[model samples]
Target: MASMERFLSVYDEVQAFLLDQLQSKYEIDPNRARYLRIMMDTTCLGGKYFRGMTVVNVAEGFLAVTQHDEATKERILHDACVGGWMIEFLQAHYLVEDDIMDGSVMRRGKPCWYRFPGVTTQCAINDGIILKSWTQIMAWHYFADRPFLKDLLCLFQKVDYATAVGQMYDVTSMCDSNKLDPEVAQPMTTDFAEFTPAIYKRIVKYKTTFYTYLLPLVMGLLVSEAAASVEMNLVERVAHLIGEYFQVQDDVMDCFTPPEQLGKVGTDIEDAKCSWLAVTFLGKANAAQVAEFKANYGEKDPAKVAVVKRLYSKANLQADFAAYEAEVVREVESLIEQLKVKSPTFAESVAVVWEKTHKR
Candidate 1:
C-alpha cells in the first residue's frame, strides 16, 4: 500500500473501534451515534496527517534501530499506529475549537465546521469535547494493561495543559491588543513596539511546539518501551529549537507566500498578529520606517498590505530569515550529534522531524 493509504488504513481501524464503542459499548441511540460518527470522521480524516504520521514513523524508526524481529516489529507498529490515530483525534478536537475561537472561515479548503450551514457554535464545541473524550476512551481500551499506561496518560495530560496555557497566552496577547474586537470592525494598526522576540518564542513554544513537535515523538518513544533509557530533556531541547524555526517559517510564509500557494489568505497583518516578521522588522527598521509600518501593518486595504510588504523587503527580512534558518540548522545538527553518542535511535527519531521541517 502507499504510505498515506497505510496511515489511513490505521485511521479507519480506530474509527471503527470508536464507532463500535459509541454504539454497543456505551449503548447510545443509533441516531446520536451516527451524528457523532460523522463528526469524528469528517473532522479527523482530513488534514496533512503530519502529526499522526510522525508517531508511526518515529516508532518504526526506533524499532528498526533496536533490531526488533519481524513479529515484534509488526505488533509494535500496530499499537503505535493506534496511538498515532489517537494523536489525530486530539488534534481534531483542538482544531475544531480553535477555528471557532479564532473566527476562522476556511480549513482544509472548506468552511470551518462551525460555519457550515445549520451548524451552530454549540454543536461544534460539543463535538470538540466529544473528540477529547474519545481519545481518552481509546487510550484506556488500548493501553490500560500496560505498565507504562499511567505515564503515557500523564504525558497526554501534561501536553494538553501546556497547550492550553500557551493558547491562553496567545488569546490574551491578541485581546489585550484589541486585535479581535468585532466592535472595531476595521483592521486596527498594530504597535510593533509592544512585541519582542522573547514574547514570540514563548507563544511558539507553548502553542505550536509542544503539541506539534514534541508530543508525537515523545509518545512514540514511550510506546516503544524506551522511556526508561531515553533522555527526555535532550529530546525536548532539540524539539523546541526545531519547533521555533517551524513557526518562524510559518509566519514568513503567511506574508510572502501567495494565497493560492499557501492554500488560504494570509491574515497575520490584518489580524494584528504578533508574527516573527512584525517583530523582526520592528527590531531592524528605523524610526521613519517604523512610522511607515504603523500606518500599513494591520490595515485590510490591498494597497496598505503592499506597503507593508515593501517595508519588509526594505528591512531585508527574507535574508534575515535565511540567516536564522541556517543558524537553526547548525544548532539542530550539533544537538543531534550529541544525542547520537548515548542513543542513536533517539537521535535518529529527532532527525526525522528536522529533515521534514528543514525541507519546508
Candidate 2:
C-alpha cells in the first residue's frame, strides 16, 4: 500500500514552511496570503515527479553502494529530498512562463494558470518570479549549513541562465525577435528557414537537456558526495544522448498524445517551435506535401493546423520516431555498459533514469 505518498506529504510541508516564513517577516494580509497559497498550489503541485525522484534515488542508491553509516544516510537523504522538491519548484516556474509564451490553454489537465478565472497574465508573470526565487531561497533556507550550499546555488544559477539562452534560441527561430512588435498578438508561425538540425540540437541542449536531466543528476552526485570521485565527462555524454532522446519523445507526445493522457493540449503545430517532428518532416516530405506543410505548419487556424497534423501522419512520424528510439535505446545502453567499467556505482545510480525516461 505504500507509495511515494511520503514524498507528496513533504511538498505540503514545504508550502506551509514558505508561507509561514513570508507571513512572519512581512506581516502579510490574511486574504492575500490565502491567494498566494492558491497560486502556489495551482502552479506547483501534481506531476509524475520524475526529476525529483532522480535526485532522491541517485543519492540514496549512491549511499547504499558506499555503505554510509545510518546517521549519514539520513542526512544525505534529507538534503536529497530538499534538492528534489526544489527542482520541482524550478520546473513550475518554467512551465508557467512557457504556457504564457506559447499561448497554451491547459496544463496538468486544467486551464493554464494565466488563463485561470481570476488570474491575469500579469499575475502569472509575477508568480513565475516568485517560483524562481523560491528555488534559491529554499536552498538557503534548508541547506544553509550544508557545505555544498554554494555549489548547489551555482548549479541552479548556471542552469537557470542556460535555459534562458535556450529559450531565446527557440523563440527567435520562429521569427526575428528584433522585428517583433509588442502589439503583435496570437497565432505564431515559423519559416523553417532556420529550423536546421544543428540549431534544433542547440535549443534542446540548453533548453531541456542541460536543465531538466543534467541538473538533477549533478545535484544527486553532488548531494551524495560522489562529485569528487566520479568523472563528469562521460556522465555528460550520457546526458546529451539521453536528454536528446527525452526531448524527441516529448515532441512526439506533444503532437500525438491526447489531452486526457497528456494532461495538456499539444500546441507544437500552432506554436511552430523547432520540434523534431517539424524538422524531420521538412526533410522527408515529398514535393507535393512540402507546399502543404509550409502553408499549414504554424497557422492557428484549425483547418490549417489539421492539415499540418494530417501531413505529419502521412509523413509517418511514428515509424520514424520509433526507429530513432530503438537506435537511442541501444546506444545509451552501450554507454551505461561502458560506464560500469569506469564508475560502477555511479552507473548503477544513473540507471534509474532509464526507467523514468521514454515513457508516458
Candidate 3:
C-alpha cells in the first residue's frame, strides 16, 4: 500500500500543480475567467488518474534506486507529476470527444463535458481538442532544461501517434461491418480466451500504458540522466504488462460491477466497446448467438443488456475473463522477478504495480 500511498501523494501534487499553473495565468475578462475555470475543473476533477500515477511511480522509483540527493528527488518527483498530469489532460481531451462519439450523458459520475446544460456538442468537441493541445504546452515547460528532453519529447510524440492509431481503430470498429469479418470472428468464437491479447497490447501500450505508466518513469530517468540501455528496456516491458492488466481490470470492473461500484454507467456494452470480455464472449458464441448478443448489447438497450449478461452467465464468460486475468498476472510477476532494480525508483515502481494487480 506504500506505492499506492506514494502515488496518491503524487496525484495531489499533479492536481495542485495544474491549479497553480492556471491560477498564475492572467484572465482579463469574466468570460475568459469562467471558461478557464470550467476547463480546469473538468480536466482536474475526472478519472482515476492511473496514467499520471505511472509517471510519478516510475520517476520517483528511479530516483529512489539511484540515491539521488533530496533536491534532485524533489525535481524528479515534480517532473513526473507534471507528466502524469499531462496524461490526465490528454484523457480529458479524449473523454470529451468520446462522450460525443458514444453519445454518453455522464463520465466518472458527472455530466459529460459536452452535455453540460449550456454546452453544445460541437463546443465540447472543440474543447477536447483545445484541452489536448495544452499537454504539449506543459511538456515544453515541464522538462525545458532536463538533459534528456529530446527523448522525452520523442516519447510523448510516440504516445500521441500510437493513441491516435488505437482510437482510429476503435472508432472504425464501431461502424465498419468488416471489422467483424469471419476470419476475425473466428477468434471470438474459437479462441475467446485469446481474442483481445494483441489488440489490448497495442491499445494499452499507446492508449494507457505509456502515458499512464512508462512516460513518467522515462521522464524521471531523463532527469536523473540514468543509463538508458538494458534497464530501460526491461522497465518498459514491465510497465506495458502491468498497464494492460490495469486496463483489463478496469474492463472487468465496468462490465460486472454496479454503477455505484464503477462510479458511472458502464461503457463496454453501451458504447459497443471492443473490450477483452466482449470480444471473448463473441469468440465463444456461435453465429446466431453472436448476432443475438450484438443486436441486444451492441446498441444500448436495457433489455438487451440484461440478455447479454444472461448470455455471458450461460457461456461462463466471467469465469473465462478471470482465468485469463490470473494468467497475465502470473506472467507479469515472472517478468518482475527477472528485473534487477538498483534504483529505488525502479524497485518502488515494481512494488507499486504489484500492489495494484493484487488489489483486484
Candidate 4:
C-alpha cells in the first residue's frame, strides 16, 4: 500500500516490451493472435512483485550513499524493472512446466498458459524456454552500456543455475527415488510418499529463495555500486529467510484457501506435493492415519480423503503450521531490525520486504 506508483509504472513498461516482442515475432491472424495474447497475459498476472520491488529498494539504498538525488532514484527504478522483469520471466518459465507436470487447468483464475488454444504441448514447453532465454537476452541488451553489465550477467547466471538445480531436484524427487537418497526420503510410501518437510524446505530454499529474494537485491546492489562485504552476506541471508517464510505461507494458503480465492481447489494432497505440511503429518501420523493418508493423498480416493482430513485434524497439522507462521514472522521482524543498523540499503530493502510478508 506504500504508493506502488514506481512498481506499477515499470510493470507497464514490461508489458509494453512483452507485447512488442510478441508482435515482432508472430504474424498470425487476429484469432490466433488473440490466443497468443491470452497466453502472454496469463503468464504476467497475479504476483507479489516483491522481487522487482526489492531490487528498487536496494538500488535506492545504494544511491542514498553515492548520489542521493531524485534523478538517481529514477535511474534505479528503471534498472530494477529490468531485474524484476527477469524474475517474472523465470517464474513464467517454471509455471508453464509446472502446469504441464501437474496437469493443471487454471492459473491465477485463468486457463494455464500451456492450455491456451492452438498451443501444442511441445510448443508450450518451448515457450517457457524461450521466455527464460529472452529474459537474459533483453537484460543484456538493456544494460549493454552500463558499467556492470558483465557482473549482472554473472549474477543472473548463478541465480539461474540455482533455480534450475532446484527444479531438477523437484522433478527427480517425484519420478525417481534414487535422486533424494534413502536418508532424505525416510518413510517413503508406495505411490509417492517422498513429500517430506525437509524436502519441501530444500525445494523452497533452492527454487524460491535465491531467485525471488537474493537475486533482485544483489542485482540492485551491483547496479548501484554497493560494497560486497560481510554485511551484504548478512543481508542476503536475512532476505533468503524472509523468502523461505513467504514460500511456507504460500504452501499453507494452497491448502486452506477457498477455491474461488485460491484460483483452484487445493491439490497438495491429491498430487502428492512435497509440502511442509504433508511431511510433518507423515512424521507424526498414526498407523491408521498413515494408511488413510497414503490412500487419500497418494491415489485420490474419496473415502480416503475424509479419513485423511480427520487424520490431519487429529494431528493438528494446520494449527502447527499457523504456529510456525507466527514464529517466522517474528523472526523476520527481528532480522530486519538487525539489518537496519548497518546501512539504509538494508533498511530500504527490509521495508519493501516487510510489506510483502505482512500482506500474506
Clashes of each: 0, 0, 12, 0
What does candidate 2 score on TM?
Answer: 0.91
Every candidate's lDDT? 0.81, 0.81, 0.67, 0.71
| TM-score, structure 4 vs. true | 0.83
Poorly placed runs, candidate 3 (over 4 Å): 1-28, 67-69, 175-205, 227-230, 286-288, 341-347, 357-360
Poorest lDDT segment (10 consecutive residues) of candidate 1 = 185-194
| lDDT (tens digit, per residue) of candidate 3 on 215-237 | 65565566557645237777788
Lowest lDDT sum, 10 consecutive residues, model 3, at 186-195
True lDDT of residue 159, candidate 3: 72
TM-score on alpha carbons, each prediction: 0.91, 0.91, 0.80, 0.83
lDDT of 4 at 213: 80
Summing lDDT over every window of 10 consecutive residues in candidate 2, give the lowest-scoring window. Answer: 1-10
C-alpha displacement of 202 in model 1, angstroms? 0.1
User: How does candidate 1 fare on TM-score?
Assistant: 0.91
For residue 3, model 2's alpha carbon misses the true position, in angstroms, by 7.9
Alpha-carbon shift of residue 182 in model 3 (angstroms): 22
lDDT of 3 at 279: 69
